[PDB]
Amino acid sequence: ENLMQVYQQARLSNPELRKSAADRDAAFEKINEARSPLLPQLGLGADYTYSNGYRDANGINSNATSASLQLTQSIFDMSKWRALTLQEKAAGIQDVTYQTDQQTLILNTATAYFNVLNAIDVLSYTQAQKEAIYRQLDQTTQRFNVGLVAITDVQNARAQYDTVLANELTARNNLDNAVEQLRQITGNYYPELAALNVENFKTDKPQPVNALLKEAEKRNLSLLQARLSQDLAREQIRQAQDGHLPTLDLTASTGISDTSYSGSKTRGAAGTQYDDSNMGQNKVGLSFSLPIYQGGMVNSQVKQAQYNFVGASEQLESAHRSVVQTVRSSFNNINASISSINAYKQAVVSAQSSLDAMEAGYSVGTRTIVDVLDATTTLYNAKQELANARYNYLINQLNIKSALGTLNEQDLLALNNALSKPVSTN
Amino acid sequence: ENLMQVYQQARLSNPELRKSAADRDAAFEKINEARSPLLPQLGLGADYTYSNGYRDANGINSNATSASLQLTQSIFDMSKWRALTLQEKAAGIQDVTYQTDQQTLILNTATAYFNVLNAIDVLSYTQAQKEAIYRQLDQTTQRFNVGLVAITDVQNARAQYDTVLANELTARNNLDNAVEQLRQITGNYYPELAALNVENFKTDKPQPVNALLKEAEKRNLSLLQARLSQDLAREQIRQAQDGHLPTLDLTASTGISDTSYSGSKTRGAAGTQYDDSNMGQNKVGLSFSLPIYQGGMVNSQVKQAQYNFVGASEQLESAHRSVVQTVRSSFNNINASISSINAYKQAVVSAQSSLDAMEAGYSVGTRTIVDVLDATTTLYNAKQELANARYNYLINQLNIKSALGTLNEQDLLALNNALSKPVSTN
Amino acid sequence: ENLMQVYQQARLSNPELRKSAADRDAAFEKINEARSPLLPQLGLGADYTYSNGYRDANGINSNATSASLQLTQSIFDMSKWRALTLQEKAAGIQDVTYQTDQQTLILNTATAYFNVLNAIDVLSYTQAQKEAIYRQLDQTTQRFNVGLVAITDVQNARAQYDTVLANELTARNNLDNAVEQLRQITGNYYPELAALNVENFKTDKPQPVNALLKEAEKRNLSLLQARLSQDLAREQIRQAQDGHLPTLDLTASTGISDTSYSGSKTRGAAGTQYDDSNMGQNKVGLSFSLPIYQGGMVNSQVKQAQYNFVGASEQLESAHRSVVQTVRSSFNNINASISSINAYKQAVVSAQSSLDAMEAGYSVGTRTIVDVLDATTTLYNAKQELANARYNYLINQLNIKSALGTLNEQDLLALNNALSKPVSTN
User: Fold this and answer.
1) Out of B16, B23, B29, closest to residue C303 by CB
2) In Å, how far from its chain's centre is CA A70?
3) Separation CA B337–CA B389 (nearest Å)
4) Looking at CB atoms within 10 Å, which of A59, A252, B344, C177 has the fewest?
5) According to the UniProt topology, which residue ranges lie Periplasmic (chains A, B, C)?
6) Angle at Cα B180 formed by Cα B178 and Cα B182, nearest 5°?
């Protein structure tokens, strides 16, 4: 129910987070097959085959029968080690992006949480507006009944009333909308959520921008991923270099053989050579090769890896400019939130005193209760529009921390301190 | 001209629909080559080759003249069947997404069709606004001429007139833009389109939400595609399992070769063995093999397929909760459309009576005709903003029908029933 | 500083432009390896291997020792030439898109610049608004001090003041934002930028739209790229046709051999055949093959390439509809800009005369100076909202020129003519 608990149940409800985790699992597991080729290749084959050599040596008839194990083991080829390193760095990549997605979950969660509150706010306010305009219409109606005014005004207040009805329904509708938005990252409905403890609000001042810039230089996930991409490009480079490598290898195998000769040609002077055999063999030995020159195969690849490299570096710098922009913008947004909160506070005070004034106006009955509710309307609107400003302060409070690439459950707990009273959702 | 006919010509004018159709054609045709490998592989590779030995067995010249056909046919390998099933499911995928795109074309079609209707409205009424403000400029002008109100007001009205002119030009401009928007899907410019039969609106109540839930769950295209994706992942799993398959084979080949001999070394005791060859051959037989352990080849792939599976499943549930969200939101939007239509109707009646009232004001001339056209302004603005609301009702109709995964020409035919009088576009 | 210089320093600062450049370098360089296969394949693969017979073959140990260079050279396979042509066309593609981004850098570069100007504008004027409202607060305050009015008004003016303060901070904030936006393209902060020379502002009429269309047919980069895609699809088609090609080839290689015998079975009646032999060889000759029939390999591929072709064609027409839409829309936007500029000009004149009027009002003291500054507020707001309109005129100019697929530094120079006075940024 509390934002913390909301994070808790939602910690498993997210598929994409779990999806990404599983993807990381795919990467780390893929490292295994990345290690695989270096290991020896035990194998087996078998065959049977009749043959008939027509023409010249025509009339011979020869079935053939054989089977063999074939162990093989390459030794010298660093390219596989290279690919292994690629797999490693890619794994680190997947790790980082996974953490990123975690932070994303945090953000979305908090956002969706606040939206419900805001919807409740607008709901109630639009309601009070409804009643106010309603008795406005009733008054005006009665005023026509005694004939003081033109019918046109009656229809006017009519239109006001219908309009505000639409305003009710759309808002109430937005309520459940946001509710389902919450279920989207939960899979569960919630009857109620804790109200903000506005009385104990934190008007915390921002840290100086430069240190934040430093921490940003140190620990944004994205730029880190860029650097990993760069190093990976370097790995691609040496992998392109790998083509020049001599390929030391070692075969090892044994094989049975049968083959029973037949046909009239075998008859007469078989000379043992035409006789059926039972031979078997245990071949084992080195294998090796070297490309020397291959039409410029391993040449263009080099430059390709190079362009890939420098381009990746460009992406890195782009990320750099990006994080600078983002963090500054966030900081600034926080300040904006501050000032806005100030303004709306004062507005609250204003509408309040105005309200009390008009209430006194009804105290000796100078006005109508309707008007009192008009001031009441302005009052509430100002109220949780100010609350809205506070939540915006919170969101910015996360974004800057998000900008750092840091974030944790603990910040959300600090948020959880802010919550207070239970509040029914619908 | 009518929305139905517009859809009719639209059915061929769309490239992307036809594109997707042809893509389905590709997906189906590819199933054929998916069936292909099982078929026998006939072949030929005759060639000639000189040879000149040296060192130890130096000086014995020769030249082979090989020529042989090679039919081949493996029998046991389920992995290919697996890939066939994959291709099948892929074809189902392409099918589903194709139908989806059809619905998409429908939606966009009706949308663009309505936008024109709206722009016409805004155009006309804006024009009336132009005339009204104009004659205000004239009145105020003359009022300066007789020496009354200060020049500043004159320039004010001037600004009004110029501003509203700009509004005209941008209005007309948007009109032709929308016309082109229509041509974009149609490839045709249309001088005129049918007006809505506003007199006979359909105030249908929405069905209870749960039934719609059950239906859409039963037949949404997207989630269906997800399920196909999951099944495909399972197929990938058995395909990973396929690496344990022994590979039964059957070679079948034949042909002749003539290696003529030459060189001085052949001279002396040729022993028939050094005579020129003239042999042919008819080899045929099985070629079995089983991989045994191979460094963990067919291992990591298993878990990879597994993670692929579960992640796909997570996507499935994701899309599930998603469509729940969407359909509820749609229902809600429809209700909003209802209430809005109500409100604007009443606003229409109101502004109308206000109009008639002021007209009566001019009946003894208390006002100016411009004022009457101000009431007229608010009037028609209200009118076809209400029309706009009705179109929104239509769009929501198609949307709720869309989330079902249903949709067809028929609802659009009912929309065609909604249409009435011809109206020139520009 | 001037827009031209800004473009100049920026012209190298862009990563993505340089990125695309290097990518073009890749596309070109890859043509080399595309040419590569036709070249001769020199090679080598020496190796050594022990052998030990058993069962009938038992007791005759040996160890083969082989070494051989291996040149190879294919003669006839058009598919390689085909793929070469593919690579060529791909190079053309990367070229074109590179040109696209070359325009893209320009557009944004103007955009942010004008945004900076605008931000400066709104900033200053908001400041003036601040001072005005401030003195209203002071007036109302003092008025309460002598007690002419209710406290509620005091709080009202209070609220106005805090609000406008918030507007200041967000304004300044937006200023620095835009500054950083500029740095994003440049990597450099800028103290100052040239003011527009509004006095000599251009108002050229657009060329008639049809001529612009014929011009459009010439060289939009996008559509050209589409046509290249089509031709590429055709190349894919002939490449599918290339599976019918007989594969004429030429083997050419030489190698030595040693192979030493061992074992007691070799002893006795060796018959020369059971003796060590240091043979060498110089094999050379033709190679050839032809598929005949392969289970429908090169069949489904044909239809596949065909579908690829037609789909590409559909994309081409899609691009056609696209460019028509965009160019007309641009033209229209220009017209809108014109009329808007007209309107705001007149508004400026109006507010000006109103200002002078009220100034005269203070000349004999009929009003507060604050009010005069209110007119001042409306004044400047109108002023550089009009400026904003002029920049929109410029942006539209660049847009329509962009739709042409044209654009150059020279148009930006023509823009550079428009600039005038130096202006500090913050």
Assistant:
1) B29
2) 47
3) 7
4) A59
5) 1-40, 75-246, 290-426
6) 75
